[PDB]
Design a protein around this nucleic acid. Structure first.
Length: 674
RNA sequence: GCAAUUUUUGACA
């Protein structure tokens, strides 16, 4: 099949931090980057599914990207410009994703910028003190214009007149300045009394094309849209938004229908206004396709097959694409508002992928959905903290355990409209891991108990049918059974052998302990890692030889991954615990902490590892062979999960707020960077 | 959708 990305959420409260060029390509500022989305036939997506894909990222700003604008000049649609709280304006080439050139002319926080629609190399930027810079990127010239001591919110160069720029301020002031006359103010458009969010020029020049020079429209926090006459410097029309509610009021003035005007509205609803008169709501016949929070940016995009689309960004973290002909939602791209901490596929709902995210919502992605490549449901009730751990029930459909950074353990019925059940017992620290296993005493004295491991070092056994009851610290059983007097290690990982007969605990000191049912008799201690154990995974039971099921891979804060073979020690069932000090296999190549390892269900002994070194490595573990290295994340990987359907496909999540679905066969590098 | 949120996580172990 083919790669796919859930990207970070578009940035909020910026008058222009997204834009699109024909064909086409959509770009949106998110965090300190711009993410690029191919839209239309060029996307190369599965037939019958929405034609778009996230394809690249502009990396280099060191603080929030506040502004983004493409060059709309034929022959240079690949050029674009950004502004950032790092104080720079960068010019980029999207083909190579590199900085062409840049400036640091602004002495105050940049508000926005706009590529001249008329002058091929002109980018105009404005800051929160009211200073405007003109920048001609080819001659490397610039001009400083300090118009008014006033906080710029938005700026839009005229599409008709190369010298005229409209500027909108936090206090509701709107001016038109002439950049050839040292930024002289040509018009003061008085009327708004609160933030200007958007300025759109009429796409036709002249003032003989409207039922009541050039016309322009301004949208404001004051809940009105004003249309102005650029000859008489006065208002000619006021539109009042229909029903302190949130509002970002942005505009798009369609070229093919200049008597119409598109705006955002309360709640992120989109409206098409008839200027010859009043408004039509987008997606009126299924209102639920609308955004559910304020919309910030609207960007038209005409595909190479001449479909006229409109992309919208929103506080609700969805990017939506609208068919302007029908006012219907063509597709929705979901996005992530924090680290992708955890990934888990359900064994009983094929392709159902749960994602634990730092923004306090669980995503469930129906990855195999035929209608939609990003069929994602969001669960927030009872979550409300970073989701650091997940584990689907092994047999119960829709039953999902989750754990949070604040120590909470919960149980979701994802097929339902119900809030989750919360365990009355919390960990003191982050929930690292959840696993289902057979109950142990006193609980065993439900087919499966829920086990949770917290950062404080305790593993708890929860009864999924009595979560408001007490959870049990398994150390009490471990001590009893094994006659342990000493100070218990701090547990940092738990992993059940597939047969439910053997539990492995990883510890902060690097040790791995092997315990047997029914009473957790200690049969083995593995002393191989020298640092905290993050991840343990037992090989599946459906490989070509029974021996494979005794294989256990593990990763610590050191870079070297080990495989151990527990067949001898388990089958011997010793009456006093053995120590293993030698690995069955060693997998060297990463250069930082290993956060997660997972065996392919499709192969004998094929492992993928996620690392702080910013890569996922695929190994033929039994031959200690590095196969391929995925380098698509820009940050520390936190989780990895094999596709349950495709031997070639792996999903990974990182602290770059991204989930990538990628193919082992498409990777150029065989090993991690050295 | 029917919540909240001007959000966007120093590093070790």
């Amino acid at each position: 099949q083919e790669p796919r990305t859930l990207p970070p959420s578009p940035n909020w409260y910026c008058a222009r931090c997204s834009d699109a060029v024909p064909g086409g390509l959509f770009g949106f500022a998110a965090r300190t980057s711009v993410f690029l989305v191919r839209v239309g036939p060029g996307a190369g997506e599965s037939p019958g599914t929405p034609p778009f894909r996230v394809i690249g990222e502009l990396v280099g700003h060191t603080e929030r990207v506040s502004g983004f604008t493409f060059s709309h000049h034929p022959g240079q649609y690949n050029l674009c410009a950004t502004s950032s709280d790092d104080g720079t304006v960068k010019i980029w080439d999207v083909e190579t994703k590199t900085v062409v050139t840049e400036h640091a002319l602004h002495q105050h926080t940049i508000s926005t910028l706009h590529w001249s629609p008329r002058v091929k190399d002109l980018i105009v930027s404005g800051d929160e003190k009211g200073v405007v810079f003109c920048y001609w990127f080819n001659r490397n010239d610039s001009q400083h214009l300090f118009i008014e001591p006033r906080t710029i919110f938005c700026l839009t160069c005229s599409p008709h007149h190369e010298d005229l720029v409209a500027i909108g301020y936090k206090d509701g002031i709107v001016v038109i300045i002439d950049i050839s006359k040292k930024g002289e103010v040509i018009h003061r458009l008085r009327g708004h009394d609160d933030e200007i969010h958007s300025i759109a020029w009429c796409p036709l020049p002249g003032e003989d094309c409207l039922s009541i020079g050039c016309y322009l429209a301004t949208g404001s926090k004051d809940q009105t849209i004003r249309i102005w006459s650029c000859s008489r410097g006065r208002g000619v029309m006021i539109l009042k938004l229909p029903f302190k509610e949130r509002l970002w009021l942005t505009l798009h003035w369609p070229s093919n229908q200049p008597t119409q005007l598109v705006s955002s509205c309360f709640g992120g609803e989109l409206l098409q206004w008839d200027l010859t008169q009043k408004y039509t709501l987008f997606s009126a016949s299924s209102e639920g396709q609308n955004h559910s929070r304020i919309v910030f940016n609207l960007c038209p995009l005409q595909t190479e097959d001449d479909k006229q689309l409109l992309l919208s960004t929103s506080m609700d973290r969805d990017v939506k694409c609208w068919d302007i002909a029908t006012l219907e939602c063509s597709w929705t791209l979901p996005s992530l508002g924090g680290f992708a901490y955890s990934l888990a596929f359900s064994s009983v709902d094929i392709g159902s992928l749960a994602i634990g995210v730092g923004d306090g919502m669980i995503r469930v992605w129906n990855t195999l959905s035929i209608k939609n490549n990003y069929d994602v449901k969001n669960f927030w009730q009872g979550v409300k903290s970073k989701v650091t751990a997940l584990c689907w029930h092994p047999t119960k459909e829709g039953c999902l355990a989750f754990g949070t950074d604040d120590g909470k353990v919960g149980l979701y019925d994802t097929y339902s409209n119900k809030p989750p059940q919360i365990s009355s017992t919390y960990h003191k620290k982050t929930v690292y891991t959840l696993a289902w296993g057979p109950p142990v005493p006193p609980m065993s004295l439900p087919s499966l108990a829920l086990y949770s491991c917290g950062g404080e070092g305790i593993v708890l056994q929860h009864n999924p049918w009595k979560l408001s009851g007490e959870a049990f610290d398994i150390n009490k059983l471990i001590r009893d059974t094994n006659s342990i007097k000493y100070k218990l290690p701090v547990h940092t990982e738990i992993s059940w052998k597939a047969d439910g007969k053997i539990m492995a605990l990883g510890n902060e000191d690097g040790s791995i302990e092997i315990f047997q049912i029914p009473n957790l008799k200690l049969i083995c201690t593995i002393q191989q890692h020298h640092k905290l154990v993050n991840t343990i995974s037992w090989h599946h039971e459906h490989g070509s030889q029974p021996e494979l099921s005794y294989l256990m891979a593990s990763g610590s804060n050191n870079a070297v991954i080990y495989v151990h073979n527990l067949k001898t020690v388990i089958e011997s069932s010793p009456e006093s615990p053995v120590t293993i000090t030698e690995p069955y296999r060693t997998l060297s190549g990463h250069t930082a902490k290993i956060t997660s390892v997972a065996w392919s269900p499709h192969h004998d002994g094929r492992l993928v590892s996620a690392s702080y070194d910013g890569t996922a490595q695929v190994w033929d573990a039994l031959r200690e062979e590095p196969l391929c290295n995925f380098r698509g994340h820009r940050g520390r990987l936190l989780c990895v999960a094999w596709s349950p359907l495709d031997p070639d496909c792996i999903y990974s999540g990182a602290d770059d707020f991204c989930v990538h679905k990628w193919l082992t066969s498409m990777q150029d590098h065989s090993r991690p960077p050295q």
